[PDB]
Amino acid sequence: AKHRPSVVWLHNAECTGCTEAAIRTIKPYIDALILDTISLDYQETIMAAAGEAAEAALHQALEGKDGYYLVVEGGLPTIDGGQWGMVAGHPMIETTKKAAAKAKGIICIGTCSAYGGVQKAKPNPSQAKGVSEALGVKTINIPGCPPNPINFVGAVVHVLTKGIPDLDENGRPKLFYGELVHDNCPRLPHFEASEFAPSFDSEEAKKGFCLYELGCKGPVTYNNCPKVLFNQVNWPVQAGHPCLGCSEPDFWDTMTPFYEQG
Amino acid sequence: PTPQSTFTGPIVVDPITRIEGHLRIMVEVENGKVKDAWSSSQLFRGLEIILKGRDPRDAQHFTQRACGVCTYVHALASSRCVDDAVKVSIPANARMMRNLVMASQYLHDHLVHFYHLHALDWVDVTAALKADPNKAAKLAASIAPARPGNSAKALKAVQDKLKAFVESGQLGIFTNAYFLGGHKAYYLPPEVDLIATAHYLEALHMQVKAASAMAILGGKNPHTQFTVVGGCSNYQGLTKDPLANYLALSKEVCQFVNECYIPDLLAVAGFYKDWGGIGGTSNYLAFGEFATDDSSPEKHLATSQFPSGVITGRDLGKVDNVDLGAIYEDVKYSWYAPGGDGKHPYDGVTDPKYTKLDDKDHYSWMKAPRYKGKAMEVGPLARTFIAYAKGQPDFKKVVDMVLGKLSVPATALHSTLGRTAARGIETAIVCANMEKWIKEMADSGAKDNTLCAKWEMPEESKGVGLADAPRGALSHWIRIKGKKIDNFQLVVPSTWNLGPRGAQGDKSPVEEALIGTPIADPKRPVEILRTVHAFDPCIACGVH
Ligand code: SF4
Ligand code: SF4
Ligand code: FCO
Ligand code: F3S
Numbered sequence: 001a002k003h004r005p006s007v008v009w010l011h012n013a014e015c016t017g018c019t020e021a022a023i024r025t026i027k028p029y030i031d032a033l034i035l036d037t038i039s040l041d042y043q044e045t046i047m048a049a050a051g052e053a054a055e056a057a058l059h060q061a062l063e064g065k066d067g068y069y070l071v072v073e074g075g076l077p078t079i080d081g082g083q084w085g086m087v088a089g090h091p092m093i094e095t096t097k098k099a100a101a102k103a104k105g106i107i108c109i110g111t112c113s114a115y116g117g118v119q120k121a122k123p124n125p126s127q128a129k130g131v132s133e134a135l136g137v138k139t140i141n142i143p144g145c146p147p148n149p150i151n152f153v154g155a156v157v158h159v160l161t162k163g164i165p166d167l168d169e170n171g172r173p174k175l176f177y178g179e180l181v182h183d184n185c186p187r188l189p190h191f192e193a194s195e196f197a198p199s200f201d202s203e204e205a206k207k208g209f210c211l212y213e214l215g216c217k218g219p220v221t222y223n224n225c226p227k228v229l230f231n232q233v234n235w236p237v238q239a240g241h242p243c244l245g246c247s248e249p250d251f252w253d254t255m256t257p258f259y260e261q262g
Numbered sequence: 263p264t265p266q267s268t269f270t271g272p273i274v275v276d277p278i279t280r281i282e283g284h285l286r287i288m289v290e291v292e293n294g295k296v297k298d299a300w301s302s303s304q305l306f307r308g309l310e311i312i313l314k315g316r317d318p319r320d321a322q323h324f325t326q327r328a329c330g331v332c333t334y335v336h337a338l339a340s341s342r343c344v345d346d347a348v349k350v351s352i353p354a355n356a357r358m359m360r361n362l363v364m365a366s367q368y369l370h371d372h373l374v375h376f377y378h379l380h381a382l383d384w385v386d387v388t389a390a391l392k393a394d395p396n397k398a399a400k401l402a403a404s405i406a407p408a409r410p411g412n413s414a415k416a417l418k419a420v421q422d423k424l425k426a427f428v429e430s431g432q433l434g435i436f437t438n439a440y441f442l443g444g445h446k447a448y449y450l451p452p453e454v455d456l457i458a459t460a461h462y463l464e465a466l467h468m469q470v471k472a473a474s475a476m477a478i479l480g481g482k483n484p485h486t487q488f489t490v491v492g493g494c495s496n497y498q499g500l501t502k503d504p505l506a507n508y509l510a511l512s513k514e515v516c517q518f519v520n521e522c523y524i525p526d527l528l529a530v531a532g533f534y535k536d537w538g539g540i541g542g543t544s545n546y547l548a549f550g551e552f553a554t555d556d557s558s559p560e561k562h563l564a565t566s567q568f569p570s571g572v573i574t575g576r577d578l579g580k581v582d583n584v585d586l587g588a589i590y591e592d593v594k595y596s597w598y599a600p601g602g603d604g605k606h607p608y609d610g611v612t613d614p615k616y617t618k619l620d621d622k623d624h625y626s627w628m629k630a631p632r633y634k635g636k637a638m639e640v641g642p643l644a645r646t647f648i649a650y651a652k653g654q655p656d657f658k659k660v661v662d663m664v665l666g667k668l669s670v671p672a673t674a675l676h677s678t679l680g681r682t683a684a685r686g687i688e689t690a691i692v693c694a695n696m697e698k699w700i701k702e703m704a705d706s707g708a709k710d711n712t713l714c715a716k717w718e719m720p721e722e723s724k725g726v727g728l729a730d731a732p733r734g735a736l737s738h739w740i741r742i743k744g745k746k747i748d749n750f751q752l753v754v755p756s757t758w759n760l761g762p763r764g765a766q767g768d769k770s771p772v773e774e775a776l777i778g779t780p781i782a783d784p785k786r787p788v789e790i791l792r793t794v795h796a797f798d799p800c801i802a803c804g805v806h
């Protein structure tokens with residue numbers, strides 16, 4: 001009946017936590033999304049075809065008459081002509097470059113594809129890079145490690161029904177990343193009052209005191225975690241653990257050591 | 263009998279879909295049967311190299327990103343690893359909370375694997391359209407507990423949804439499936455495909471609840487954030503209302519496990535009984551999990567309710583104790599520099615060196631873990647055999663219920679069918695213990711809410727963190743020097759299972775299990791997928 005917009009989803013240097021995050025959506029659920037809203041035409045984690053049959057499915061999708069949107073999960077290993085990351089005997093950098101070329105839009109799910117992620121952390125043995133840096137094209141970034149499904153599905157639905165949303169200096173949709181974690185944190189009054197837990201065993205910790213002295217990066221991290229929560233039930237600081245700053249570029253090197261503010 | 267072609271030649275499957283990560287499988291076929299195999303991991307990231315020189319407290323946050331499917335397990339192994347190096351013993355509530363989050367991970371991981379990664383190798387979704395809903399409802403009454411989602415009405419709606427989807431011409435994730443137009447290796451009647459398919463869609467919703475249950479204690483899923491050196495940070499997770507919600511969600515997930523997962527698994531195994539003689543191996547290793555005493559690696563090995571041990575040559579009459587000093591990794595057939603063979607993890611070396619695609623001398627980014635020179639299978643099957651041999655009561659009852667239902671000997675479990683059944687078996691056992699474990703922590707946390715112990719960072723030390731993740735024996739090994747990470751090595755279940763050959767050219771478990779695989783249709787080699795998927799491969803885990 002109604003044609004569903006074609007989506008191609010590539011996996012590069014990733015942990016698959018972003019794919020897992022996506023299927024946690026409940027507005028709508030993943031089945032309703034791929035049955036009614038979009039046409040997920042390639043997705044290695046869940047697709048039935050394998051090997052050459054899967055590679056053909058990808059090439060059929062890239063040549064579709066109605067075009068397609070590209071979702072990229074994971075960073076791009078560039079050392080030795082990109083050979084440390086391959087699929088179907090092709091370097092990941094080469095396949096993403098080919099797919100990015102005719103994409104209607106490119107969405108980077110996760111800090112890895114947006115900015116390079118964990119494999120990019122010093123000393124970066126695989127010379128990994130973010131998509132935009134590796135391809136030389138602008139991308140819509142949905143960062144976090146992994147991002148909230150509300151943010152990813154929200155961006156996808158937005159892109160297909162209203163166009164590209166307003167993006168911040170780091171390519172992140174302002175709808176979801178326009179506020180600091182810290183500004184919506186329920187422990188903010190403890191912070192204002194200088195009431196910090198000195199350790200995890202302390203009474204201060206048991207009383208729910210601010211976790212800044214323990215390394216919390218909420219004050220420099222843009223995300224909506226305390227507003228929307230994860231899995232409809234929790235978020236790190238609610239669980240008594242400091243924010244690591246997982247939605248910020250190169251956080252692996254700029255936010256460490258995680259348990260300090262130095 | 264088992265469909266087999268007369269094909270002689272090579273077959274390459276790349277990518278292996280419906281797993282975590284990037285795997286390339288090569289086989290030599292002769293007269294429709296696999297005579298030789300190679301497991302080739304296609305991605306290197308290098309977490310071990312990245313951790314060098316960093317704060318030991320940061321390790322868990324880096325290593326958790328080894329994998330987003332078996333999320334949490336690495337954060338747990340790293341926490342145990344560093345807790346051991348600083349010689350701190352975690353409070354009882356911390357042991358309980360850590361083990362419960364692991365239990366929730368088992369439930370989520372195995373449900374998703376069976377339905378969303380494995381099932382499409384046995385179930386022909388398109389043939390579900392050929393089924394009569396009323397005949398499927400009646401058949402569903404003869405293979406599984408009574409439920410509204412199995413009514414003719416429900417199965418018709420599923421069929422109607424599927425029919426509109428297929429009639430659109432946009433087959434999405436089913437594009438070019440090996441089952442399209444029919445396939446000789448797919449045995450299930452249309453009525454069973456329809457039942458399985460309805461449950462496939464239901465599991466998509468149920469997994470969201472299993473993740474919510476885990477996030478109540480873990481902070482969020484994927485990638486929990488509640489563990490710290492010396493215990494846990496989640497005081498809220500010891501309180502009444504959160505644990506009541508945790509129980510309610512867990513009970514929903516377990517009802518789905520017992521009403522759908524086990525019954526679907528048993529039906530499928532019933533039709534594919536011939537797979538009880540395909541894909542078997544001989545040696546099994548498990549570090550054990552769900553211990554009553556996690557104050558040290560030794561205590562973990564000895565008090566794990568899912569017992570640890572080593573079985574060799576299928577001898578269920580001799581379960582040996584795990585010798586952590588007898589573990590080492592070879593790199594002879596891996597993409598690493600020469601001179602790194604036979605290294606114990608404490609002396610681990612990660613020096614990447616690529617050659618070329620399909621180089622029979624160097625064909626994987628995974629190292630080859632060996633135990634006293636032997637390849638070891640790890641995971642649900644290993645745990646099941648070890649627990650059964652030791653007469654673990656819960657495993658004996660369930661293994662026996664399965665053998666009684668399938669009318670097969672216990673030796674039939676040394677196979678791809680057993681490996682698949684084992685995963686279901688332990689899921690049922692975890693489910694049976696959830697209410698007991700939750701009550702134990704509820705009462706303890708109400709009484710005393712201590713959750714994290716005091717500790718001190720030593721100038722120099724070492725430690726090992728053990729866990730039996732959903733895929734098998736996991737171990738993290740740290741050397742601390744100058745209060746920093748000097749060496750940090752991961753030896754992961756998929757490394758044991760899917761790594762390449764060792765220094766003696768000895769095949770790994772998956773390579774060995776692939777030998778003798780019948781290939782009905784060389785163009786659509788589903789049989790290779792069945793066996794490989796049975797091991798539940800996680801390549802990002804394997805290589806890290
Ligand atoms: S952004 Fe994080 S969760 Fe997503 S792929 Fe990268 S490491 Fe995994
Ligand atoms: S816990 Fe972190 S986010 Fe919340 S108030 Fe304290 S510093 Fe800010
Ligand atoms: N389970 C799991 Fe992942 C693997 N292999 C880990 O550890
Ligand atoms: S760690 Fe990441 S998930 Fe939210 S709480 Fe901080 S941005």
Ligand SMILES: [Mg+2]
Pocket residue numbers: 310629751752753754805806
């Ligand atoms: Mg390793």
Ligand code: NI
Pocket residue numbers: 282328329330331332333800803
């Ligand atoms: Ni994994």
